[PDB]
Design a protein around this ligand. Structure first.
Ligand code: HEM
Ligand SMILES: NCCc1ccc(O)c(O)c1
Length: 453
């Protein structure tokens, strides 16, 4: 069969379609019009966007397709190096770092990070406890302060002290500006136009800022010899069972930058969309709050208590279903293959999985796919393979998944234990797109339940 393709702009092909502030949302609209697969061409390149579980399940066959670095992660690679997110499967440092780090990221490994997660969560709750009557909460802003500080404490025992600041630590400022330069580069018509000599200079400065801090901490740690409960300690002690090698210090620095750059925002966006859905759905808020009150019976939550927050984890999954915050991933065909019995592909041909549209497949979820209903996840095993994929696929799935979910369930539990919430502005959802998705401008008021920490 011949594939549909959205509107063209002469020699620019479909490229101007992505020249917008909200390209993923634009691509979802196109998928609504064109269906489970469409061709997307730009000068010099072609990809095919997949939206159905029928075709996505084939794309997720790792014997047939492997991760592709699309343009964004290619630009992110300029500062994240050959860290796990920006490396090809066939690079020696991807398999080395995968094998060393998968055990430091498992559900069991979360017991080790739990106390430093509670440290930063307690700072968030004390913040909101200390608001005056007339004040409000800037949700994504505070959620980013929490996840950056949590990843810096668990990753390398470094305190950004985001809740002590209006201007973030210089490393955060450089990192955020670096991710922005990377994303902006996707829409830049003439990247060598002297209008960007300042943007290129700033990018190199930002690379230098991030490198210097992270190298300095690594060095500081190797010298002291201090063992901590962070990922840096595991990375200095770890050896790949396959090669027998450890990660070198350059690659360790790249992984620390990666954890921060690639993990903080998808996680803070998750928390912010989950609070959005709960304030707009007071029956589900109340159910999640009754579970938090029933389960979090101690002044600070334990690892075991967080695991008992079943309905909070359903709310988190349902927010990921409607707005998966890391919204697409790219693949390439390892060999010639026919996709879906209908679409012949050649070795090297690219696919994109458009996650929000997968998660609207009515053949899997039913007709009410736009509705927020946590109870879809009462028994997650009922969901078919490759139907719910907010964390990617296979060996190249998110290595942060259990970290993100521990963090988000711990924090949303404490928030629901400690405050009632009001959508005092009747906020209208506005989804900003960076590397990730979040509800821009989402604000709420909290009223303390006056329960001790
Ligand atoms: C709700 C939060 C998050 C979501 C939705 C998310 C989603 C994803 C997805 C979709 C990918 C696959 C990307 C691809 O195929 O190109 C991935 C990879 C990755 N994520 Fe996450 N992530 C989240 C949180 C995090 C956290 C907290 C960390 C680290 C502390 C993290 C670190 C990584 C890394 C290193 C990879 C690359 C893994 C590999 O390819 O070996 N992520 N993530
Ligand atoms: N750890 C998430 C990093 C990330 C960000 C955006 C995406 O589209 C993606 O596939 C992965």
């Amino acid at each position: 069969k011949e594939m549909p393709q959205p509107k063209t702009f002469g020699e620019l092909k479909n490229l101007p379609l992505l020249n917008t502030d909200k390209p993923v949302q634009a691509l979802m609209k196109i998928a609504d019009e064109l269906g489970e697969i469409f061709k997307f061409e730009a000068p010099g390149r072609v990809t095919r966007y997949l939206s159905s579980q029928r075709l996505i399940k084939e794309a997720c066959d790792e014997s047939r397709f492997d991760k592709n670095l699309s343009q964004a992660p290619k630009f992110v690679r300029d500062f994240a190096g050959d860290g796990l997110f920006t490396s090809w499967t066939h690079e020696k440092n991807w398999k080395k770092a995968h094998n060393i780090l998968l055990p430091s990221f498992s559900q069991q490994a979360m017991k080790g990070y739990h106390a430093m997660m509670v440290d930063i969560a307690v700072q968030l709750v004390q913040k909101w406890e200390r608001l005056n009557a007339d004040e409000h909460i800037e949700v994504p802003e505070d959620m980013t302060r929490l996840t950056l500080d949590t990843i810096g404490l668990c990753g390398f025992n470094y305190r950004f002290n985001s809740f002590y600041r209006d201007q973030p630590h210089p490393f955060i400022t450089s990192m955020v500006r670096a991710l922005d330069e990377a994303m902006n580069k996707l829409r830049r018509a003439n990247p060598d136009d002297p209008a960007y000599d300042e943007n290129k200079r700033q990018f190199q400065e930002d690379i230098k800022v991030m490198n210097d801090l992270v190298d300095k901490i690594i060095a500081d740690r190797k010298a002291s010899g201090e063992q901590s409960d962070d990922l840096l300690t595991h990375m200095l002690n770890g050896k790949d069972p396959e090669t027998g090698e450890p990660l070198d210090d350059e690659n360790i620095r790249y992984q620390i930058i990666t954890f921060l750059a690639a993990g903080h925002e998808a996680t803070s966006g998750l928390l912010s969309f989950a609070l959005y859905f709960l304030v707009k759905n007071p029956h589900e808020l109340q159910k999640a709050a009754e579970e938090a009150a029933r389960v979090l019976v101690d002044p600070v939550p334990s690892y075991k208590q967080v695991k008992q927050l079943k309905y909070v984890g359903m709310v988190l999954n349902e927010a990921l279903r409607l707005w998966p915050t890391a919204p697409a991933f790219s693949l390439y065909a390892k060999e010639d293959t026919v996709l879906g019995g209908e679409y012949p592909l050649e070795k090297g041909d690219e696919l994109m999985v458009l996650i929000p549209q997968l998660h609207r497949d009515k053949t899997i979820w039913g007709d009410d796919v736009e509705e927020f209903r946590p109870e879809r996840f009462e028994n997650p095993s009922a969901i078919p393979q490759h139907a719910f994929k907010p964390f990617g696929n296979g060996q190249r799935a998110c290595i942060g998944q259990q970290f993100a979910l521990h963090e988000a369930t711990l924090v949303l539990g404490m928030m629901l234990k400690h405050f009632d919430f009001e959508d005092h502005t009747n906020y209208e959802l506005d989804i900003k797109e960076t590397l990730t998705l979040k509800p821009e401008g989402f604000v709420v008021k909290a009223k303390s339940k006056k329960i001790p920490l």
